């Protein structure tokens, strides 16, 4: 599911920005953990390892 991952609470103030520049688009990859793509279990970790 496109839409990259993984930030804390996404804080934005609107007092800092200007009515202007493009606000970069996060060259960050989408690296999803297998133990976070599903439910974590003692059986699946044996499968993953």
């Amino acid at each position: 599911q496109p839409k990259p991952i993984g930030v804390g609470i996404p804080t934005i103030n609107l007092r800092k920005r200007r009515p202007n520049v493009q606000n970069p688009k996060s060259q960050e990859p989408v690296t999803l953990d297998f133990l976070d793509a599903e439910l974590e279990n003692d059986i699946k970790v044996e499968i993953r390892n």
């Binding site: 609107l14 007092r15 800092k16 920005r17 200007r18 009515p19």
Partner: protein, 48 residues
């Protein structure tokens, strides 16, 4: 020492010209040129 009849003038002339400024110009300098709802001052590259 022949100047404290002259330096006593400016010190009395400042006290005159300070109080005139403080009466007429009290707090005019506060209004902004900020942007729409944000907190940036809006200047043009060279302007103070």
């Amino acid at each position: 020492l022949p100047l404290f009849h002259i330096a006593l003038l400016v010190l009395f002339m400042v006290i005159i010209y300070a109080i005139i400024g403080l009466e007429l110009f009290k707090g005019k300098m506060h209004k902004t040129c900020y942007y729409i709802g944000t907190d940036i001052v809006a200047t043009v590259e060279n302007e103070k």
